[PDB]
Design an enzyme around this catalytic site. Sequence first.
Site, PDB file in Angstrom:
ATOM      1  N   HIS B 151      -3.056  -1.355  -9.792  1.00  0.00           N
ATOM      2  CA  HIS B 151      -3.118  -2.346 -10.851  1.00  0.00           C
ATOM      3  C   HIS B 151      -3.776  -1.833 -12.120  1.00  0.00           C
ATOM      4  O   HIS B 151      -3.619  -2.460 -13.173  1.00  0.00           O
ATOM      5  CB  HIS B 151      -3.877  -3.588 -10.382  1.00  0.00           C
ATOM      6  CG  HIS B 151      -3.137  -4.400  -9.374  1.00  0.00           C
ATOM      7  ND1 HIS B 151      -2.074  -5.207  -9.706  1.00  0.00           N
ATOM      8  CD2 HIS B 151      -3.317  -4.544  -8.040  1.00  0.00           C
ATOM      9  CE1 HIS B 151      -1.625  -5.808  -8.621  1.00  0.00           C
ATOM     10  NE2 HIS B 151      -2.361  -5.421  -7.596  1.00  0.00           N
TER      11      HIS B 151
HETATM   12 ZN   LIG Z   1      -2.553  -5.897  -3.624  1.00  0.00          ZN
END
Ligand SMILES: [Zn+2]
Lengths: 77, 384, 31, 116, 183, 322, 340, 79
Positions: B151
């Site tokens: 992320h």
């Molecule tokens: Zn995740």
Amino acid sequence: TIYERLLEIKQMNERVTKEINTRSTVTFAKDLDLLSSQLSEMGLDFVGEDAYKQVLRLSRRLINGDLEHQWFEESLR
Amino acid sequence: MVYEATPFDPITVKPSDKRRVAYFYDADVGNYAYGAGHPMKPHRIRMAHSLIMNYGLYKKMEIYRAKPATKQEMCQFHTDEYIDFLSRVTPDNLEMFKRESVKFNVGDDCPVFDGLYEYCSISGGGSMEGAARLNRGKCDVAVNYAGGLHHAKKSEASGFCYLNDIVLGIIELLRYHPRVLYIDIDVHHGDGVEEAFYTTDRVMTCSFHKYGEFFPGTGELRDIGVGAGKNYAVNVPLRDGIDDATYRSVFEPVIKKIMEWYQPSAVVLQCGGDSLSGDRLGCFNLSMEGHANCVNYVKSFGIPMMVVGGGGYTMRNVARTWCFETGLLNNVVLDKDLPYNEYYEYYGPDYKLSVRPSNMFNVNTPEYLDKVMTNIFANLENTK
Amino acid sequence: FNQDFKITQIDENSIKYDFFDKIYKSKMVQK
Amino acid sequence: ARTKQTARKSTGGKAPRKQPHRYRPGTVALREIRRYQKSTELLIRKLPFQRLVREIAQDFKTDLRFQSSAVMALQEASEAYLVALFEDTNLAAIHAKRVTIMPKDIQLARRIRGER
Amino acid sequence: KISLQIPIKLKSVLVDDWEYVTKDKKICRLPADVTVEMVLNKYEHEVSQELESPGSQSQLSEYCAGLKLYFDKCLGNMLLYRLERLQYDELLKKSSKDQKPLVPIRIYGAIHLLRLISVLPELISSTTMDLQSCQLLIKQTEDFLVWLLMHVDEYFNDKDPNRSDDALYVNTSSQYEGVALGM
Amino acid sequence: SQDILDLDDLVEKVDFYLGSNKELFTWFKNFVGYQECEAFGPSYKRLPKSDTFMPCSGRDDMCWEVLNDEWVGHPVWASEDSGFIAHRKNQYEETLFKIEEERHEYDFYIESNLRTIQCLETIVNKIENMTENEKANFKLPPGLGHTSMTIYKKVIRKVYDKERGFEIIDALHEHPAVTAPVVLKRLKQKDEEWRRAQREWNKVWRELEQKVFFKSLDHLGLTFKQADKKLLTTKQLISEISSIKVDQTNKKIHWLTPKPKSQLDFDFPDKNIFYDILCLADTFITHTTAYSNPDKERLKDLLKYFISLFFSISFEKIEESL
Amino acid sequence: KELLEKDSKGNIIKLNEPSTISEDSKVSVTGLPLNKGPSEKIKRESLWNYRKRNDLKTFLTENMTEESNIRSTIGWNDFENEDFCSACNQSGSFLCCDTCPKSFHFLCLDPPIDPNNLPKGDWHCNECKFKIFINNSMATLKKIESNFIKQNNNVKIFAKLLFNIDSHNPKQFQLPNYIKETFPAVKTGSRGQYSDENDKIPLTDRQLFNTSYGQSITKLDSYNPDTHIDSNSGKFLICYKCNQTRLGSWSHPENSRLIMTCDYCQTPWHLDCVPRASFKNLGSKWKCPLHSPTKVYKKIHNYKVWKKQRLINKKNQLYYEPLQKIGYQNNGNIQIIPTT
Amino acid sequence: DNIQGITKPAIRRLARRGGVKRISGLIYEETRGVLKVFLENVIRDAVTYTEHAKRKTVTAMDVVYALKRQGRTLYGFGG
Ligand SMILES: [Zn+2]
Ligand SMILES: [Zn+2]
Ligand SMILES: [Zn+2]
Ligand SMILES: [Zn+2]
Ligand SMILES: [Zn+2]
């Protein structure tokens, strides 16, 4: 509705019976008593009996009122 | 007429697909903790590793401690100011960096713990050394559970991820491989990795994620890449409670079509444990067999792969599935009876390897997944 | 100036005629 | 230069993260003076009152169950105490050429009552 | 009570600007390919020859110069949203780097001039200005506004920043968003 | 018709309008003359060239070629500034997470302290086997020669005082000869006391896990009783058959001229289940008290007679099987 | 407190242990310190009942681990101020006025103040600074206004406008009401942000997190057949594409297809007929595919864009009927009249 | 906060039964504190009595017993 609910249990009765009967517990949990004691204390464990017949007996006991709802649900789960 | 409802076949290894497996573990990774109330725990790495050692899996593989990344090497993807902030911020001098706290999204949902720079260095070094060992031919499978921070982006920290080590690993793979396929079986969308390689055709980023009002919100089916990277970012949106058979019948055709159409030279597999049932943040219904079937299926193609472990916020389930996946890469199936480790008290009540799925509604209908895979297959026709 | 955002009051038959006219124009100019 | 922090958030976007006939004032008031004076039912909604007792008894002893009749005894006693105190307050007000009970009117009553 | 007759096309342009800044989180391309001076100079050079009255010419040049001075002195105060104040800060620091003071005439585009026009009656009502000056300033602003309709397709165009680099608005970064609306 | 909408989007809109009418949407598909890029997607927007130019010192030409720096996405942009919906978890799942949280707390602290004990005892067994004339000027580098530079700092700052932890770290760096054994002894005492507390807590955690875990893994079963009360009613059972009939009548006018003479289909492959339900019903009749004994026995032969008459089962088979 | 007891020559002798008991009993996540174990009050409901081998292979790793540095990049490659900003009316980190109860964001001022390069002694706002400037000068306000008008003789009409905004504190620009009232669909958010008809009513926290386990706003965790049934009519919500309502049967709940309604025309759509996985609970209003677009891009073969005109209130909106029926170039902004 | 459960209209109802025609607004929050401290006196004694019987539950009998001590007897609930 009842017959479908029981037929879902009976159609998978042989594999769940073979899974419960062939439940090889791990060794260090037996030596260090980490498993659930109460589970079999109430004899809920479906070991040694046919799974669907034990479901029928447990449901009969639940209907008769000698078995609590939570213990019946826990045994089934 | 693309999706086929198929029952989950048992996991079988291929004896003709023996791979030299490299394991990257730094004993320190676990001694880092995001916070007191925080779901992400690096401690899941070493109970996964304790299951590797106590299963006797170290005799079929080589254990390496990767050199931690320096400041510049992190700047192969991130900016100088973001790495400079990451290497200097501590919980003590958090008030000295307030503009950078909101600039780089560090302080809330990505807290400042005093081993942040070292944790990121361990993760990035593990990913880059796994890719480097894949480049030189020293190993066929590189296993690094220290990373998986998919992320993290160029100048921000999101989703409990600070250093996008997967982008660094794919960068190191691209120096020797022309086409690198990134597969993300994490329940969240690999927004950092997909965003990094959105405009390039050299990296195909495939993500099998839940797409609702779920984090990070990116990952619509229409997101297929722009510029030269058009149709080179496959997004597979899934609903809640997908089981092993459904996930297998979605994963295997898509990855197979990518394999015979994109034809990659290296594979990066994000093994997020939050795709498992019973996760704190995940909403899928995968058992450990269902999670590991993706790793076993991608192993069958023979492409030199980098298995990198990502999410997973219940430590016991992610540790067990990482141990099973690691054992699967050595062409063995570990028995469902856990050996004695120092963290044996986590895996109650049965103390077995298996992660039991929940009995929740598989709301991913065959028609929806058929349409999803039909549009995905149609977009993949231009990747030859 | 309220005359700039005037909403055209059109009917179904005029839309039908315009759609038919413009598709016939496009088809025969490409032909 | 004095500064203060109010966002109380190290980072923004916390949500997007992974972790007609009308009576004159007083006539209705006197009407429901008559209504709540001719009546005998209990004016502080019960549940709320019971709770007041749980959170306040907790201090003296944990896990203290209360017989139902008890929280009804606490209610009765509390409503009797407050209606007596409010009669006195109205007096402590009608004393000072006024018709509006005010806090001061009850800090006094309680002083003369000697409950302070 | 002071009223301004802004055309609804320019009202919709201002509302679309509000949409782009607050909802779509878009800032303006600064400096624009067409600035504010550039609009107040072309309008003067267009309506200067439209009539042959020298007092009207003096009044028009007076209005244009006053609008320019007002724009420069008030842009930093009350002419830009909270998102664009970070861009204002970086412009001020960039101007201080090269030791030239920042003038908003040559930097900001015509949309901020339209913002100044739209917020102008409230500023008129907040000062001790006599009725004659208020009426004539409102009249001159109205004439500039109806001049803007004849050139609304060349100052306020509609372009997606994701498709065209020559759009009037640009998409913002997450770091800009965090610094602008996080502290 | 205004030369605004493109033919491709017009065909897409008509496809969304007349998709199920295959014959009509083909008339149009061709009556029109459609023959079978820049798809950016909803969750990416393009930065200008000014925002792209940010110094990344480690990037070579290949890194600048293969990495995207103009198209970005954020969770706040994809949320439309609203937020995200977390997955709802049971209270048993929440207390399982709390048990795991406490477990992680204890294990993180104990293992960090154990790693510091290992490093400090390496330093101690190094310093024991040398004399005192050079033990005075012996120093220790940051990290104590370990791969971490902060783990021992965390352990010292926790075990000792907040203000005194820094000065103990500095005393260990400058004069480890006196500070190392006392720090090692205190860390070992804290280790054994934390481990005893962890075992006593491990008992409690294991028993709650045994109490909680299978209910936590149960999702539909935790709410099945209220769901069965709400949905196994007359209204819902009428709604199911009426919805299937409405679907059949709606799709009858489009195709499938042989309209089916049934809505619901029930399969009964096993016959012993009838005897099982009859035994359960008989058990309820025997147990219950709100029904009179004549009503009880009439219920019994009504159920037996209906099962024997509806299906192929005989009354003799029912009597011999129950 | 004399940690290192040095000798007369500076040599170390013996150190004293600091206060371990200062934070030996800090409350951990368990609610108890790590020094002690669980209490009986939590042992009652945790344990089932309460009455009143070392063959580890995990120590062999350090030895079996070989370092790895074979990468190509190895080596080197008073009064309390407000708590809302006085300029934008939003929370955040503020710079507080000393002789004034107003607080401003660091970026909201003119010029914006760096959060590290603060003013050393005192900071006054623009209004406060004008107040000290007026009180320090002997002449009154109108005298300085007239002097500023006469000195700035180049511009006369804007001179009173130029003078009065030095006293005004900086504020965030907001559109006036008469620009907003001409478009009735356009609303103003809580933060002053844009809002219009393509925006949902924000769901309160009573709906998101204060709901029962089985029933979730996501409508994915349970079988809910009270969504195919119209509330005000009682009929079945027939999906537009498949022309069916897949209600399910509660004995086969996997046969039930999820259905949602459009937020504009209330046309019910299955979750599979239009490819969607979410229900669109919060954010923008969901638009079904049948609605005409308000923004389209077409290829020039650059490009051209068209946006539909915003809705205008009835006092300023003119609906006109063409005289020309065929080929009338309308801007795409039209209204359909009934055909007679 | 359970204290804020003693709502205004309820304090108004107590004043009405008490014959008050206009309640200040600052009274409502004074009546809470006075209420609390009083209940906090009875219930205290109610419990001393309770933990003298080694009973863990309190009774209404103990409540009227604590009232008798304070001075304000309550008839209608036993004793
Ligand atoms: Zn995740
Ligand atoms: Zn001030
Ligand atoms: Zn502000
Ligand atoms: Zn449908
Ligand atoms: Zn619709």
